[PDB]
Amino acid sequence: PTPKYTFTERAAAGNLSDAEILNSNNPTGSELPDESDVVVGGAGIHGLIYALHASKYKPNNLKISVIEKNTRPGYKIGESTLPIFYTWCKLHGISAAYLLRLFGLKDGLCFYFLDRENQGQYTDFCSVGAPGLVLASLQIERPMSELLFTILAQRNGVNVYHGREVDFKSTVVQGGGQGNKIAVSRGKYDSTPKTIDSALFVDATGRFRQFCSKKAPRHRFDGWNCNAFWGYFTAPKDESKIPFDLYEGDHTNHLCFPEGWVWVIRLPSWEGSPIANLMDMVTYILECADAGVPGDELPSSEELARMFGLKFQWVTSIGFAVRNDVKYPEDLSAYGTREAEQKFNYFVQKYELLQQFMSNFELIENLYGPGTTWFIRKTLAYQSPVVSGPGWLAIGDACGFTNPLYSPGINVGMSTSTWAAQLSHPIVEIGKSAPADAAESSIRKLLVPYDDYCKSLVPALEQMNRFNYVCYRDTRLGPQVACLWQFFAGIERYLSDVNIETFAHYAIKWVWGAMVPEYQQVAQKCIEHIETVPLDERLPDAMVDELLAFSNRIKSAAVAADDFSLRWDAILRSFDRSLNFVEGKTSRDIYTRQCSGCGAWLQLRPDWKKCHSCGLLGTEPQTAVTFDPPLTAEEEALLYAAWNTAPKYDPSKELKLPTPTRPA
Ligand SMILES: Cc1cc2nc3c(=O)[nH]c(=O)nc-3n(C[C@H](O)[C@H](O)[C@H](O)COP(=O)(O)OP(=O)(O)OC[C@H]3O[C@@H](n4cnc5c(N)ncnc54)[C@H](O)[C@@H]3O)c2cc1C
Ligand SMILES: CC1(C)c2[nH]c3ccc(Cl)cc3c2C[C@@]23CN4CCC[C@]4(C[C@@H]12)C(=O)N3
Ligand SMILES: CC1(C)c2[nH]c3ccc(Cl)cc3c2C[C@@]23CN4CCC[C@]4(C[C@@H]12)C(=O)N3
Ligand SMILES: [Cl-]
Ligand SMILES: [Zn+2]
């Protein structure tokens, strides 16, 4: 495909604002339609996942309009994604060669547990991702992911309107076929709002809960909650002075300690780029995806920036997520003038390993515009008691949220977005095909499982979060109990069998393994014990011994009962194939390398000889995956064979679940 500059030139020719050039790519036009089947409030990641999955699940069945008040895709925290998300992107026609042009490579999750009373001591928990010929995970800049999904939506019959706001004061949502009149304006000041007559409203307004907050007060869980404060930093090419042994930048790294943890995410940023130019670059990437352009013949990220006149840079997202029962000194003026900056810098100097770590990074001022050097958000976790009703349902953060840890926000949250998407087809058809009372009753009964799933989802995630947090109070419980159990219960078994048809059903059965009985049993034992130790104290060594012994007794039987074959010793650096902790073990598979030219992390596969980020040809044209223990040529061919082909679904075979096999 020859690159086209359609939007850059259209924007200049008509002197178009950001919202106008974006809305000009809509299939039905730049102005709002008088009527639609579904109106989606909000074009965050979940509103767009919803609209994309709905249209892809059953094309040309629903007219869908998405309303977003930002003038262009705005900044969001929430950058780490997991295999289920990549698989969804691949099922929607965008595989790793194209996604890696826009987003950062992610190869697994790594944890470092810092001893508070023994400053300098630490342990770790390492895990790898997958070979390049299997899949990739992604670190995504959210203005770019939401641009990507906006353009892809517009190319699949979905209209997306930026710079437009749902007026929840005058909007009417009812049952009865085409019962909704969604009022859309350019803002409070706008005297001439438009109405979209529609059947179904989707609340995808995130934590603002702009519609469902009208139906039930926000619900908070018992006990402590969390606060987060964060900023953006340079990303060094040379990672060798990082004070943690075997550190690698292409993991989602976790620096864990009694009060909480720190995320470290390496990702590319497109900030400074005009929106029209970005639209042209994304459109070009999609055309290359459609045409199946091989990765080595696809321009590198930096080459795309030159082609389309973009700004491109490597940044590190670094933030704290800590309990809100931490005692702070009253006066923190020595660490800055803003509260976020003050508590960030205060926490860094409380741990010598954090300060030595942060000394590798340079602060970036105002990456996302003025006032954005530092961010703070208080009291993270919540749940919406009511997530559906006549004429509407809620998805994503609008249903509830817990914590950044293990990234449930996007990767678990998309189970609601995609299930709601699948359900929207019968919901709309019912309303077109039955009298009003029976339509309302049938739709209500159809959504009972959706409501019940959401109701129990966030509490399970909250228990999962507390489980990890309390275990992070000790450098043995963190890696040997909490991390081990999260990955044993939550690894995505049979992900290679999922397709568009079965995606939502698979996704709602995952929950990061937080529903697995043996997981909840260990989690409850640890929480019950550790929550009785005041935060400012060290856990008694006998308590750690007892919890570790309890966890290991439950583990051996649950592991024996799993019938899923997996080279555990190759994936978890510190564990053998039966998930026993091995004190000296360092052997692991190696799926990635760092580009010597630009520092970008790359996936090892023989058909990708050039760095996908800067284009530098491979340091030597023969670095291949290292399997430890080794795999034969046939076993390696077999692994790849299972993941290149996506299966058309048979309506008869039952879905294989991601969670471990029941002992029964
Ligand atoms: C500190 C922190 C770290 C996190 N880290 C991660 C991570 O690593 N990985 C992960 O997966 N998740 C992470 N999360 C969670 C993640 O940020 C959220 O789960 C996710 O961004 C929510 O997506 P959403 O589409 O539901 O809502 P949002 O992305 O918040 O989008 C809601 C949208 O609604 C729009 N809107 C609001 N009102 C109106 C209106 N009246 N009319 C029109 N539009 C409107 C807004 O403009 C916005 O675009 C993190 C969260 C926090 C707080
Ligand atoms: C299942 C998978 C998506 C996964 N999900 C994880 C969750 C937590 C942790 Cl710690 C690791 C993983 C992995 C690594 C895996 C293990 N599988 C071995 C055969 C194919 C595959 C897929 C992939 C692979 O190559 N790497
Ligand atoms: C298991 C089932 C009740 C189910 N439970 C779901 C929950 C959420 C979502 Cl999104 C979908 C489903 C389905 C669809 C299924 C899948 N099964 C294939 C063989 C028989 C059956 C039963 C049924 C079938 O025909 N359709
Ligand atoms: Cl993660
Ligand atoms: Zn490079």
214 belongs to a structural domain: no
Rounded to whole angstroms, how far apart are CA atoms 167 and 41?
Answer: 10
Which residues are 252's β-sheet partners? Answer: 109
Compute, in degrees rounded to 10, the torsion defined by CA atoms 86, 87, 93, 99. 20
Give the closest residue (by CA) to ligand 3 atom 18.
Answer: 654
Rounded to whole angstroms, how far apart are CA atoms 600 and 593?
Answer: 8
Rounded to whole angstroms, how far apart are CA atoms 84 and 441?
Answer: 34
Q: Report how far ligand 3's centroid is from the alpha carbon of 223 (Å).
A: 37
User: Are residues 58 and 387 in contact, defined by beta-carbon separation less than 8 angstroms?
Assistant: no
Q: Specify the residue for token string 């568009």.
A: 500
Q: Specify the residue for token string 């034992």.
A: 525
Binding site membership of 258 for ligand 1 (Cβ less than 6 Å):
no
538 belongs to a structural domain: yes
Q: 112: helix, coil or strand?
A: strand
The whole domain housing 658 covers: 476-589+631-664
484 belongs to a structural domain: yes
Binding site membership of 380 for ligand 1 (Cβ less than 6 Å):
yes
User: Are residues 272 and 327 in contact, defined by beta-carbon separation less than 8 angstroms?
Assistant: no
Q: 480: helix, coil or strand?
A: helix
450 belongs to a structural domain: no
Rounded to whole angstroms, how far apart are CA atoms 53 and 165?
Answer: 23
User: Are residues 660 and 488 in contact, defined by beta-carbon separation less than 8 angstroms?
Assistant: yes
Q: Specify the residue for token string 């078994």.
A: 493
Binding site membership of 51 for ligand 3 (Cβ less than 6 Å):
no
DSSP annotation of 424: H
293 belongs to a structural domain: no
Resolution in angstroms, to 1 decimal, for this deposition? Answer: 2.0
- Which residues fall within 8 angstroms of residue 90, CB to CB, at 6 or more apart? 96, 135, 646
Residue 382 has φ and ψ, to the nearest 5°, of -165, 165
104 belongs to a structural domain: no
Annotated ligand binding at 166? The verdict is yes
562 belongs to a structural domain: yes
Residue 144 CB neighbour total at 10 angstroms: 21
Q: 496: helix, coil or strand?
A: helix
Binding site membership of 127 for ligand 2 (Cβ less than 6 Å):
yes
Look up residue 626 and give its amino acid.
Answer: T
Residues with CB under 5 A from ligand 5 (ion): 595, 597-598, 600, 611, 613-614, 616
**How was this model experimentally determined?**
X-ray
Select from 407, 381, 404, 46 the least CA-distant residue to 219.
381
175 belongs to a structural domain: no
User: Are residues 268 and 315 in contact, defined by beta-carbon separation less than 8 angstroms?
Assistant: yes
Q: Which atom of ligand 2 is nearest to the CA of 109?
A: 10
Alpha helices in 133-197 (DSSP H): 142-154
Structure tokens at 524: 């409850």
> Directed axis angle between helix 45-57 and helix 414-431, to 10°?
50
By CB atoms closer than 10 A (0-12, 13-18, 19+), residue 28 is middle
Rounded to whole angstroms, how far apart are CA atoms 646 and 130?
Answer: 17
Number of domains in the chain: 1
